[model samples]
Target: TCPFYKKIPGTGFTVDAFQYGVVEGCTAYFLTHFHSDHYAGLSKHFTFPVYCSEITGNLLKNKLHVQEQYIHPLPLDTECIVNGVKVVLLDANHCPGAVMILFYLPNGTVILHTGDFRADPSMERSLLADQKVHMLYLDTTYCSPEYTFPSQQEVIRFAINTAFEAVTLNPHALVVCGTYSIGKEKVFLAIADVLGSKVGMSQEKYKTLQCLNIPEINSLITTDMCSSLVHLLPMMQINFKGLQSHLKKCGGKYNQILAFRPTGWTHSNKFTRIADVIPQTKGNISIYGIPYSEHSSYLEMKRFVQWLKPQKIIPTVNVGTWKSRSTMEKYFREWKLEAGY
Candidate 1:
């Protein structure tokens, strides 16, 4: 969650803050991704030079109806000069088009803003891995020690295995997976791949996925709900009451329902392993809140910060309240001291 606006120091580049309107000295605007939180203020009426990943640019134009001329799409891992500023876009690994931005200011300031990311070993091989950053704008969504969870692969594997067992017991079970507008495609895609089934969703969501321009996507999705055993629905409809109502409407086509609610908040520090994780079940519905987080966990953030060893770090989320902000800063101080900064 961005607070107010996100602006790089000693530069005119403002990022993901279109809702605030405009800033006096801001010359260039950059959007990290197409997530509603990041691209809140952007619309057809707005006019400004917006830079983002190539896929994200396509989404802005197709989904948001943003003008193509004003949107500057950048290639990943390439150093490009934007209005005399050296900039680079690195894959964030959180979503399809999400990217971490690096701004090399004319004044010799090297800044890396991780819009929202899940830290992984692959990031260690990034071009900016060895670069000494002056300041880092980090995503502090799960900066607390108690926010630890399993890796995405582990969770996905668990989900696949769990769904397999559910359908094995009851072959006619409707597999429902929860997701947002853009993220968490990997979860249901894996389920569909292993089970050899097509993913079903609304026609509106089908069009939204088309904007992503993913290869072989056409073969993986079906607009008709009854065509596939696995179905993708918005997070709002994955709840207990919501699923019950949905089953009531499905009649006898599907015997039972197994829904996976993929999110980070559901995983607490108490359960350290996925095997110990339990699913909530009732008469016919089983809901599993798997640990499928896009943001980095506390341990992951520590490793990333230590590897970067930036001179200064600015928290980008959980900073709205004084208590929450201070609580997150304590982790930064500990990390800074350990890094000998």
Candidate 2:
């Protein structure tokens, strides 16, 4: 379902390319983020002209080492023409430099391609004004009643408090915060602040955040392990074997790693419903797998859909269908029956 691309006929303008999350036979392409799932057989030798945010452009050139000539860094909220159509990038608020592309077709049709976003509340009021969206490619990653989450700020606060509570008791215990290669910076950054520690991240992630140009946090990232008590490791790499391998590689420098994942599934078991952030300790290590998510909750999705009210609701992923109800349809239905809506 995500493959639906819009074309401004006779203009040679293309919104996205299915390649390498990659670009193509089309004149221009847009990449949402650097997640490998978005890749379309991208190789180091890609030559297609790409329009993306500055950080993505940095990755395209530095990681892929694609030639600088084919990369285009898009400025947020500013309209720019490629080939013959106008395109504007809006803050997707998903990851650093992630954007929702607004493509203005030469024929007066405005197509919105939300390249995976959570529908942040702070941005909602402002976003609602960009209405009359002829087509919307929505990110429905968590469009179910089972999913509920706090604000990103709240999620950070929960992580900070949880990590602080644990490490305060055992100051020497290595605090490890699990994260993805890109998105989950807030949790680790907050943990660092509370611990009076900087962060240890991969050179690529460090450089990527540096490109984000957030003065308060960008400087927090470093390759040096000893610079901070809190270590930011990819979620997949937080196991005992991975840490052991890393310790051996680094001469047993970073030691006694305690892993924690800040996520919605954190405080939940198979028998429970309505997840909330709570702390759990295993032996000497403390883990708070909180309900920290960057996706829209069911309630938020319903409100967003009600506000947008597009002629049609299109799901961005495969086997897609739109749900007008989230968190509560039964309660609303009962309440409405009582009140005669």
Candidate 3:
């Protein structure tokens, strides 16, 4: 992974220092979200003007300890100017506080950078939906046809049902869910609410989520894993030995241990042995991989790009060979995009 800024020469920056983790650059620094990958080089001790949604700004200040003066919180759909460059933030469906940025150059070129978002219907309701984009910086996380997935709502239901079905069949079974530290809060929250149960994670993890001020998630998070029927572990906390160790601590209070990992990798067989959803038994742990993605799928990206028909498409993964801009472009070659929206 690498940190690169997508800018229009004399204009502002978008996702600048994505992997580097430090913030210091051009006219203005725009953060799409508070995901660690998006703030690679950025640290809490930085001195630079950071522009993002109000929620993201709070996360940086309260969770990551970034100084308040450095954060310039902006409201969604509202235009804010920096160095004569007009900036507008749009809600990105990827995660809470995630946003799509529109940089309106004084030259009349409106460049859109979708940090990491899904092609949900609400995008059509965005204030910038009607405007034509000159350059489109795309979030091509799922740029291949095989990356197809159902709507987030449907996937949420699918995951919830799967977990509940397992729990119902085996009353004492422990359900473990895997998610990124910051992403996928909605997934665990929905599971907790629907099951009429709470999800357990580290106290600090719960505290970071509280900084986001998500009511549903805040209500579901618990420090004691045994206090709830389910344990919400970070993505890295769901490995085989990790669950194995966790089950050892269950005090024989559980009959079985099942884990669900909601991620995009399960969408293609090339990634895992099974496409869609599959259950695997490794040692004493049973794991199921669900195809729940927060980014646009192949068809979604193709249609989205076609709909915008920007003069140029810049892939945001601006690092590593597999992440080449054209590599992402090849996935949509069959679809022709006419000029003008």
Candidate 4:
């Protein structure tokens, strides 16, 4: 059975093991998001009954391919009782399926676990006015001075502009933007909206988007639908030589191809190989390195913590793991108070 709070032996306070162990008396554990860091140990070491939002449940089962035996689906903004504990799943705008879990204990203690999140003003306003939370587990992924992130709208605009340029300059140029299957679908949707045409996507991506049921977005198209506007193709499919040959034939006289990939292909040395597969263009094959991140910036995180004003703030994610400790210490020291919990 999992302890409410287990002493870390050396550390002064108890550490909550969300990744592993069974909470002995606790009836339910909230699985906030499907990100690897958050749910990596769910199926492997932990077997307690898990609760997540509807979208997250579908993602875990359909996309991540996790077994559904111990999983329970909870809809957003609704409160559900599990093992005498009140669990509220709030919309977390970081990703389509992401949610912030609020646990209300029988003792009247409330804990808000913010799974990886980006600051959405509307969501923040709703949360701030809703409840008085006691403790907040925050997403500290960018809790340092050096980290920075662009607004989602800005990044989308930049990507669209770059894509338009690529398509217009090089007729046969394939613009590839590397992105995860789930999040990239939104980018494609944005591109579709910008071009005022249906954005092409792979079968898997198309199905993923369909499952999410995002309105105002069109369906994915096959290579046969590659027109003068835009063709959204997965990076993997474009790399396969046979597939490239087929796409080239499909392109016909259009020598320039534009490919959009959400990931940074240059980092892995796969950029050259990808460039080689697609026909070269006179306008230079470019990779747009727009700063598009799902995590919060340092200032955004500080603002979030300030709004919560919790008695204790626990940092989670890379920012907290690597930078938050020192940075938050400084913040507290400047205010003449002790650092985070």
Best by TM-score: 1
Question: By the lDDT metric, which is better: model 1 or model 4?
Answer: 1
Task: Please provide, for model 1 over 66-109, each residue's C-alpha lDDT reduced to its tens digit, 9 standing for 90 to 100.
Answer: 99889899999999999888999999988889999998988888
lDDT of each: 0.85, 0.64, 0.74, 0.58
| RMSD to true structure for each model, in Å | 2.0, 4.9, 3.2, 6.7
Q: Could you give the candidate ranking by TM-score, starting with the highest?
A: 1, 3, 2, 4
Model 4 accuracy (lDDT, Cα): 0.58
Q: Distance (Å) between predicted and true CA of 318, model 3?
A: 6.2
Model 2, 1-341: lDDT tens digits are 22443433344555545443432346666677766655454456776777888878777776667788878887777778877677878887777667877777777767777777777556565544765766666676665556666667766666677677767766656777777656767777778878888888777667766766567764576788877677777778766666555555545444345666766433253444323534455444445565666566666766665555554445554333224433233433443355443
Model 1, TM vs. native: 0.95
After TM-score superposition, what is the CA distance of residue 8 in candidate 4 from its true location, in Å?
A: 14
Model 3: which residue pairs collide? Answer: 20-40, 20-41, 21-40, 21-41, 21-42, 22-41, 22-42
**Model 3 over residues 75-167: C-alpha lDDT tens digits?**
887878777778888888877889998888877888888888887655766776678888877887777666656676777887788778877
In angstroms, give how far residue 318 of model 1 lies from its true place: 1.1
The worst-scoring run of ten residues by lDDT in candidate 3 lies at 267-276
lDDT of 2 at 4: 41
How high a TM-score does candidate 2 get? 0.80
